[PDB]
UniProtKB/Swiss-Prot annotation:
Family under the similarity heading: Belongs to the globin family.
Gene: MB
Effect annotated for changing residue 121 to A: In metmyoglobin
Described purpose of this protein according to its UniProt entry: Monomeric heme protein which primary function is to store oxygen and facilitate its diffusion within muscle tissues. Reversibly binds oxygen through a pentacoordinated heme iron and enables its timely and efficient release as needed during periods of heightened demand. Depending on the oxidative conditions of tissues and cells, and in addition to its ability to bind oxygen, it also has a nitrite reductase activity whereby it regulates the production of bioactive nitric oxide.
Catalyzed reactions per annotation: Fe(III)-heme b-[protein] + nitric oxide + H2O = Fe(II)-heme b-[protein] + nitrite + 2 H(+); H2O2 + AH2 = A + 2 H2O
Gene Ontology biological process: removal of superoxide radicals
Protein name, per record: Myoglobin
PROSITE patterns to which the protein is assigned, alphabetical: GLOBIN
Phosphothreonine carried by residues: 67
Modified residues (Phosphoserine): 3
Location of the protein in the cell: Cytoplasm, Sarcoplasm
Primary residence: cytoplasm
Superkingdom field: Eukaryota
Length: 153
């Protein structure tokens, strides 16, 4: 359980992300696809992308990034009370997309890497710790839902 102080550190850096959610989304998904190429194979719509240039030029991938970060932002703003938001997300990711917790760990790493790079003024050690705590909570809760839905994850 995160403290209010930790939630504020999370929301404070997220406020910066929101200045340009599309740009942050591109950086994050590109970082993920490059650090862990296997994750790209889960996207029938994007698995053909060969280079960072192509990824950057993809309007659909940009849209996907906005969709993803907006959903994550809504979850973070709930400050742990995200039961309603997690239900549909866990169902689609467990049953349709089949995204292992391991891949959620990979994207969590990508998110932290990008925020660390773009926002040193709001992502010091304490802030990163708070974000990690928030993302671990997210994955923990997603894992529990995966279990209920019959997915090993
Ligand atoms: C912070 C974690 C993540 C969030 C909040 C998130 C959110 C979303 C949302 C809101 C959608 C659209 C609605 C839906 O289908 O549920 C989506 C679609 C999808 N997500 Fe995730 N996602 C996350 C991580 C991942 C990861 C790590 C992968 C893959 C390695 C992944 C793969 C997919 C796929 C395959 C789709 C469908 C893309 C398409 O429309 O072609 N997601 N995700
Ligand atoms: O922070 C690095 C560790 O990250 C992962 O573990 C955290 O998140 C898991 C959820 O994805 C939890 O089950 C685990 O309890 C958390 O510590 C990763 O699995 C670990 O190997 C890393 O050391």
């Amino acid at each position: 359980v995160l403290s209010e102080g930790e939630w504020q550190l999370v929301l404070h850096v997220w406020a910066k992300v929101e200045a340009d959610v599309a740009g942050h989304g591109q950086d994050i998904w590109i970082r993920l696809f490059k650090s862990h190429p296997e994750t790209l194979e889960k996207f029938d719509r994007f698995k053909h992308l060969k280079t960072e240039a192509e990824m950057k030029a993809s309007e659909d991938l940009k849209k996907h990034g906005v969709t993803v970060l907006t959903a994550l932002g809504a979850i973070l703003k709930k400050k742990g009370h995200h039961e309603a938001e997690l239900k549909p997300l866990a169902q689609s990711h467990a049953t349709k997309h089949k995204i292992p917790i391991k891949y959620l760990e990979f994207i969590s790493e990508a998110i932290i890497h990008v925020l660390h790079s773009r926002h040193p003024g709001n992502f010091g050690a304490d802030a990163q710790g708070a974000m990690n705590k928030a993302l671990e909570l997210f994955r923990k809760d997603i894992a529990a839902k995966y279990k209920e839905l019959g997915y090993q994850g």
